[PDB]
Amino acid sequence: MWERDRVIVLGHRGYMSNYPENTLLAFRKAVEAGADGIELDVWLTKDGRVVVMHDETIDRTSNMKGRQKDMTLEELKKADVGQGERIPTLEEVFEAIPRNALVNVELKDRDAAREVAEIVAENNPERVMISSFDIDALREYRKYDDETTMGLLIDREEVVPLIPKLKDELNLWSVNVPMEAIPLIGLEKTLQALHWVRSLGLKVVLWTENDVLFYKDDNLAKLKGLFEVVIANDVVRMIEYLKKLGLR
Ligand SMILES: [Mg+2]
């Protein structure tokens, strides 16, 4: 399911450019706009529920304050996360979108690993990908699920040398890396790094801050053929760009 000819487009926290991030509304809209799937962030509540929130706290996206790890689900459901949307549980999300929609669950909380794995098992795990910046979260997830597709998010240069070992340890499908690499080490070195990871047998998932580096200098086009998935805030804009390049 993650291995396919057509480049995969995921809405970052749903169609977050046009709808409130990490909401059922945003998720539905992304898929309704033609995205292959969604990406989202999860944490474990004080009562053992898996909830969708990017930040460690609800302050930025909600009308309320607090750390979700320190709240119950019921407390959490008080909040307004945009346009009357409530913070969803992971199960709520699977219910909301098609059964074959791709879902990249980003584990923000190692404590959530076991629950996430159980829910995933019940919800067409073949279309699921687990990723994290936190290697320990990934290691914990592997205690409970050794089959589901896994990606390593990277934003530190020093992590890169570790990739071969991590791949073997975690059985990674992909590394999930930022367009920010280009201004950082230059396009050519970025191309070389991508070749390196591919030489390991890894696939590649691309992301950036607020979609800006995908389009600047036509950076994304330069990477043609070296990536299998893109995570984008503006789903439609990304789909249009890919069509223009003959990739959609
Ligand atoms: Mg995320």
Side-chain angles (χ1 to χ4, degrees):
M1 290 203 73
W2 291 94
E3 310 264 7
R4 50 168 73 175
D5 295 326
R6 188 168 70 167
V7 162
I8 293 155
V9 172
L10 309 187
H12 181 220
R13 303 173 207 166
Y15 195 170
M16 74 172 276
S17 64
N18 296 21
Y19 303 90
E21 64 169 78
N22 270 153
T23 59
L24 294 183
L25 174 53
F27 299 135
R28 287 185 272 118
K29 289 281 180 202
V31 169
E32 184 196 78
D36 311 305
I38 64 171
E39 181 269 3
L40 65 64
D41 313 298
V42 300
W43 304 75
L44 195 72
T45 65
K46 192 173 61 171
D47 61 356
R49 308 303 307 269
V50 178
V51 297
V52 182
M53 180 62 59
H54 175 83
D55 301 344
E56 193 172 344
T57 61
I58 65 173
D59 303 21
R60 185 178 61 84
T61 61
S62 89
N63 70 331
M64 272 171 197
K65 314 216 147 354
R67 280 184 86 237
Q68 54 266 19
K69 274 186 83 49
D70 292 323
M71 303 171 52
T72 67
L73 179 56
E74 200 190 315
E75 287 168 343
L76 287 165
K77 288 287 206 179
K78 294 318 196 170
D80 189 333
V81 282
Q83 288 177 39
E85 288 295 296
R86 309 299 181 188
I87 292 172
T89 66
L90 177 54
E91 302 106 298
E92 267 182 83
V93 179
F94 283 120
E95 285 317 288
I97 65 186
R99 306 293 165 173
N100 71 315
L102 299 166
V103 183
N104 176 20
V105 181
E106 184 190 347
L107 296 193
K108 301 286 204 186
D109 181 2
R110 58 166 291 170
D111 291 333
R114 187 169 186 273
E115 255 330 271
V116 166
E118 305 201 337
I119 298 164
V120 163
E122 293 177 342
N123 288 280
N124 286 3
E126 303 84 16
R127 48 71 175 267
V128 169
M129 153 191 301
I130 304 299
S131 63
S132 188
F133 287 98
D134 186 342
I135 290 153
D136 285 320
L138 300 182
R139 288 200 254 252
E140 191 81 5
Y141 187 86
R142 289 297 205 211
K143 296 196 212 181
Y144 325 91
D145 172 359
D146 75 359
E147 294 185 86
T148 306
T149 300
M150 193 177 276
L152 176 67
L153 281 150
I154 301 171
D155 63 11
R156 292 189 276 129
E157 262 192 281
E158 70 270 11
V159 172
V160 168
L162 287 31
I163 284 168
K165 284 287 183 210
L166 288 178
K167 178 187 192 286
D168 291 345
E169 183 185 355
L170 303 165
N171 180 23
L172 308 170
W173 188 72
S174 68
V175 289
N176 299 22
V177 297
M179 300 291 302
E180 278 80 347
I182 292 174
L184 193 65
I185 63 183
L187 173 57
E188 264 309 313
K189 299 301 288 209
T190 301
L191 285 166
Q192 290 166 22
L194 293 174
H195 279 303
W196 186 57
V197 299
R198 305 181 71 88
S199 95
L200 305 174
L202 291 160
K203 305 300 192 250
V204 171
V205 176
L206 294 174
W207 60 275
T208 199
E209 170 177 22
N210 192 36
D211 282 4
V212 155
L213 288 167
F214 283 135
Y215 311 109
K216 191 162 168 177
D217 298 322
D218 267 306
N219 281 337
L220 183 54
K222 314 300 176 62
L223 303 186
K224 170 200 191 158
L226 302 175
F227 65 92
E228 283 68 34
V229 180
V230 300
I231 296 175
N233 292 12
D234 188 338
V235 153
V236 174
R237 183 190 186 186
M238 177 59 65
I239 287 169
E240 296 295 313
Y241 187 84
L242 295 175
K243 287 170 176 176
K244 180 66 157 336
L245 296 181
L247 301 178
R248 204 135 177 111

